[PDB]
Amino acid sequence: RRKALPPRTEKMAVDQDWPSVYPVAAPFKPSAVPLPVRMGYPVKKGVPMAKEGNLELLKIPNFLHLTPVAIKKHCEALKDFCTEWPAALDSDEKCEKHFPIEIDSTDYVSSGPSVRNPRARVVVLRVKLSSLNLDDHAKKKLIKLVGERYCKTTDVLTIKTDRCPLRRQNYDYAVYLLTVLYHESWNTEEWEKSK
């Protein structure tokens, strides 16, 4: 029928922790939050809409669960899972000379129960062909076999690999393509005399 119960207005003291109240993404319920927030279109002689029945405040994605002390505690609690970045990889030169192969990932987000995406199955193999056994004849043959996909300025190879609905299979296919490419440096035919 009808009843009357005191909300959280008379229950909150003076030193109550905020993330202990709304630890999850709460949509801000004005019936429990004693914060007198007011917004809307006021009039000439009157006051704007308060918090009771305020649909505009419900539409606005409030971030009350992102309390600074909660962020601090979450950052201090996740320090164990973090590894350690070596000092030898801070500089770009050593990081590129020791790890020239780059494999871009694709992880999108959807709005439904399905997470399928045909565009999230492509890898971008950006390997700088400058830290290998690139001589003269082999380099010329590789350039003439590639064409325009290999930039002659930054020396970064760009091959769009997306012929299978998997990422590890795309990486394996790219590795096999690079293997076949490098096979031309050690296995010739008989059409090099008429160059």
Binding site: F99, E102, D104, Y108
Partner: peptide, 23 residues
Amino acid sequence: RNLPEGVAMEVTKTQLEQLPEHI
């Protein structure tokens, strides 16, 4: 864990690797 209800998110992380086995 703190994602809104009206934004997008695409992750493009590039991994580091010296040389594979057969190369």
